[PDB]
Design a protein around this ligand. Sequence first.
Ligand SMILES: Nc1ncnc2c1ncn2[C@@H]1O[C@H](COP(=O)(O)OP(=O)(O)OP(=O)(O)O)[C@@H](O)[C@H]1O
Ligand SMILES: Nc1ncnc2c1ncn2[C@@H]1O[C@H](COP(=O)(O)OP(=O)(O)OP(=O)(O)O)[C@@H](O)[C@H]1O
Ligand SMILES: Cn1c(=O)c2c(ncn2C)n(C)c1=O
Ligand SMILES: [Ca+2]
Ligand SMILES: [Zn+2]
Ligand SMILES: [Zn+2]
Lengths: 524, 145, 48
Amino acid sequence: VLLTNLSEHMPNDTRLQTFLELAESVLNYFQPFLGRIEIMGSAKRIERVYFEISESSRTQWEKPQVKESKRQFIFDVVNEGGEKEKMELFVNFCEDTIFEMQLAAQIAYQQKLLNYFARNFYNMRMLALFVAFAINFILLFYKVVHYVLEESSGYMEPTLRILAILHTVISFFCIIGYYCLKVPLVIFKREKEVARKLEFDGLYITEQPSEDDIKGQWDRLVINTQSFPNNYWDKFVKRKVMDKYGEFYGRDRISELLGNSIDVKYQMWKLGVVFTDNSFLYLAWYMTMSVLGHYNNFFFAAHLLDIAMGFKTLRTILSSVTHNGKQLVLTVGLLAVVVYLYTVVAFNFFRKFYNKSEDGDTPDMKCDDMLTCYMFHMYVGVRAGGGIGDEIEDPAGDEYEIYRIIFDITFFFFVIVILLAIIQGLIIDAFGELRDQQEQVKEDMETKCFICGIGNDYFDTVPHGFETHTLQEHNLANYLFFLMYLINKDETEHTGQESYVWKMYQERCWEFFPAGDCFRKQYE
Amino acid sequence: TMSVLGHYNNFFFAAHLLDIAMGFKTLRTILSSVTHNGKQLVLTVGLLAVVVYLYTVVAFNFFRKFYNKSEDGDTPDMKCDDMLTCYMFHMYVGVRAGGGIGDEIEDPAGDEYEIYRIIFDITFFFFVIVILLAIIQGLIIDAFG
Amino acid sequence: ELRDQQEQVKEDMETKCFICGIGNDYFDTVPHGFETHTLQEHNLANYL
Ligand SMILES: Nc1ncnc2c1ncn2[C@@H]1O[C@H](COP(=O)(O)OP(=O)(O)OP(=O)(O)O)[C@@H](O)[C@H]1O
Ligand SMILES: Nc1ncnc2c1ncn2[C@@H]1O[C@H](COP(=O)(O)OP(=O)(O)OP(=O)(O)O)[C@@H](O)[C@H]1O
Ligand SMILES: Cn1c(=O)c2c(ncn2C)n(C)c1=O
Ligand SMILES: [Ca+2]
Ligand SMILES: [Zn+2]
Ligand SMILES: [Zn+2]
């Protein structure tokens, strides 16, 4: 570090170069370990910082529980979320990702088994799909009561009965394995958001949140429990509120409010936050059809919709229906009224044309009943290609001839041409827009620096120039390793920077991330 | 190698007309636009072939009695109550039509499943032909666009 | 097009000051910076 810290700080020194060059088995041994950041260090001028990256933590920014959490976060902040909480959303990501890298290290005999399932989750939900093809390939051979036939050999229908009871087993081993891989994380982001709300702000003492914000009201059941911050690493949050609010209000009211055999009020609260978590319910519904898959074999054909949740350019299709969805109900709400408004006119003038019959000798079928004339238009008039002039007798020799051409030629030119274009239009332009936001993030991170926010133009200006600015000088992984490194340092051991940062991290100002300039934007 | 095969049959000199494709510019672009965006194309036809399958399981397990490609019952009536044959009935007739599946299905009027079968058709038109066969054409034209 | 003009007004008022006509870039430059320029310094209700 010392040989580095002069080469970075003082260039144009020929004495140091031959001095540096004989240490090349050392500097090119430690460059795996030499994490560099840049901060605005207390003097209104920006200086480098050098530290130690451990090796048990360089190999846990692999292990794709974390890399899944990175690519969700990176797409989260740079899409929406303004500058006033950009970096505050960064440190709120680095706080959680340390808890994942502790969870990744620990991943009677039951504890040995339970870590086999949380380890192999992504490699087991993939197996729960390949079985569901082999059910819905075998199930294609049915014939009519419904008995299966064979085409290959005699041993076909037992292999369905084997692969069906196997599928309930695997789909039960993918909500066990989900229960010990992601549920401890969503517990942690819930406990932080309650512990950092009653303490730094106070709501169960001062605000008392209303009947709106339901998840505020459910959190009231956990503060009376004993082992409250079970994952939030901060086991003295109970005493910090008493020393903060025990004098404006009673020291006895707070101690009533706060405080083989297990805690029961916490365990009732832990399940209360799993079942409203959105990604867990799909893992339940994917399992509860498997139990229903033995009452009838066809229910393993609803497991093919894991193609939808399981890919990327098919997850976007499924999301495009409800992305623009609020304008969608209001338009179908207009389409169902215009077709109704063309049913009142057709009922009150034109009963005599509506014959779905066969040439009059048949006891002719009519559509002179209001609800049945209504469902005649919605089922035949919309879905046709020419409007309503198809299933209506040809008007030629009639008193209402011109008064009925107008009734058809608007119907085609007001419902099928217009109103069933901007129904398809609000779905395709949803998919045409949502596939662009996931392309801008692919671009907005490759022509801008994340933490500086500078640009590819200024930082290029040398051969191979943006690459080194994001692989040495910022490299936002390093800003997470740095805040992992402060924790293992003793508080007496903090150097000059590492206790101006760590003090600022407690008060949470975040003025020390380099806002505008980096290093080369003030030197030369 | 088609020219050598062009003497075993004269029609094989009609596969040499595709040198119009490799040989121009604004027709080389058409040919390349199919596979330029092609990775999202298989994943979507991979969804279209599953939704139509998922509407075959429902139609097989509830609605055999409507699927008559026959002539008025005195004919030894043709059915579609066989799973693979009901599947290729939807992929060949239900997609390529203009109104979904309410064309080659008998008109449901006096039935116990009347409202439960309008819903089976009006989604099929509003989930496969309107949506899913727009963003199949959409991934080809916006590739060329 | 008409659903876009009602989206630009939703944007042209949230990345510009109405009466200054300055922009979100210059007035941000501090933590929480455009919000106070339009809730104290101009806030066009106050001019009414
Ligand atoms: N501050 C930054 N930190 C890291 N990367 C940055 C930063 N600013 C811009 N980038 C760009 O973002 C890219 C990082 O995204 P990239 O996809 O390469 O990550 P990855 O290691 O490939 O993992 P994944 O593909 O899962 O995201 C870098 O190549 C870099 O060009
Ligand atoms: N000069 C300005 N005066 C007021 N608002 C401004 C001005 N310049 C920009 N703005 C932006 O316009 C927004 C005001 O529109 P906003 O929709 O918030 O009004 P509102 O109080 O919510 O009422 P309504 O929703 O009915 O318009 C402010 O939040 C501000 O960000
Ligand atoms: C113990 N501990 C902390 O003390 C801590 C932390 N993050 C911030 N702090 C302050 N983490 C993740 C942590 O485990
Ligand atoms: Ca010291
Ligand atoms: Zn930078
Ligand atoms: Zn102004």
